[PDB]
Design a protein around this ligand. Structure first.
Ligand SMILES: *[C@@H]1O[C@H](CO)[C@@H](O)[C@H](O)[C@H]1NC(C)=O
Ligand SMILES: [Ca+2]
Length: 276
């Protein structure tokens, strides 16, 4: 299967601590430097960012398969670019804090060399089982304080119910707000049964490769992007990509937690589909 585990760097999951003035759910630009924005372009050349993803090394982002096939492609446009190093999409340069500083680096928009959807994913399916895809970027990415790779779990590692994780993004889901500043929201992992309604179709079972997180005690935590990261902070403040958004959480009266692709469960597949 041509697995190349050594192409996933050991220097992963570390971010600069450079924190500052009054927050909210807003991040500083240095937080979660593996976030990516996925950009689309329709037939009259209108562009917009409508999905997220996570930088895993200097050549790849990992996202949901539903971000690279089907509905998004007809509703928004063709897959076009991936943006790294963004913080506030409303501004450029990005400047923050009472004692003011600016991000030295303009966000980078990279082309897509190839997209690899998981072979077992079915576009339009009720369950979206195996909702994962790799995007090989056009260029080797040089890491900075604002662009760095996230760690991936091993296939035998499990998140436990009650464990708190962080979903990060710009509200780029079907029902999201489309925020301009990158947001972080803390969410509990919950029993799979609580995601019964998440599919928006009855009778779908939550598989082992799916994670249910959000819910009744996390009504202030809706955000993230389709394909966007769900993170565990493990020992030594090293962040791991426990999940990516497959069905977004909804935080209203009759809403539901989100279903995430368990990324560790696809570690072998990832390693077999990356090249230097
Ligand atoms: C491209 O998107 C813009 C903005 O949403 C829209 O006005 C336009 O109709 C789209 N192009 C077509 C005709 O597909
Ligand atoms: Ca910006």
């Amino acid at each position: 299967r041509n697995r190349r585990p050594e192409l996933l760097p050991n220097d992963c999951g570390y971010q600069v601590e450079a924190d500052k003035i009054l927050n909210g759910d807003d991040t500083v630009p240095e937080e979660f430097p593996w976030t990516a924005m996925i950009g689309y372009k329709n037939s009259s050349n209108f562009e917009q960012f409508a999905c997220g993803g996570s930088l895993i090394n200097n050549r790849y982002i990992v996202t949901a398969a539903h971000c690279v096939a089907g509905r998004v492609l007809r509703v928004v446009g063709a897959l076009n670019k991936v943006r790294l190093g963004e913080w506030n999409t409303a501004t450029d340069p990005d400047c923050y804090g009472a004692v003011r500083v600016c991000v030295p680096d303009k966000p980078i928009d990279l082309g897509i060399e190839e997209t690899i959807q998981h072979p077992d994913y079915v576009d339009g399916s009720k369950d979206r089982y195996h909702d994962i895809a790799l995007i090989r970027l056009n260029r080797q990415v040089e890491f900075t304080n604002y662009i760095r790779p996230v760690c991936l779990p091993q296939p035998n590692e499990e998140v436990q119910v009650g464990q708190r994780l962080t979903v990060v993004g710009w509200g780029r889901t079907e029902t999201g707000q489309y925020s301009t500043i990158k947001q972080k929201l803390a969410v509990p992992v919950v029993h799979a049964e609580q995601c019964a309604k998440t599919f928006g179709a009855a009778g779908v079972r939550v598989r082992s490769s799916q994670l249910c997180a959000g819910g009744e005690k996390a009504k202030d935590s809706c955000g993230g992007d389709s394909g966007g990261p769900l993170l565990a902070e493990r020992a030594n403040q090293q962040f791991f990509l426990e999940g990516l958004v497959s069905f977004g959480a909804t935080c209203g009266t009759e809403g539901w937690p989100g279903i995430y692709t368990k990324v560790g469960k696809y570690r072998d597949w990832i390693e077999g589909n990356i090249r230097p």
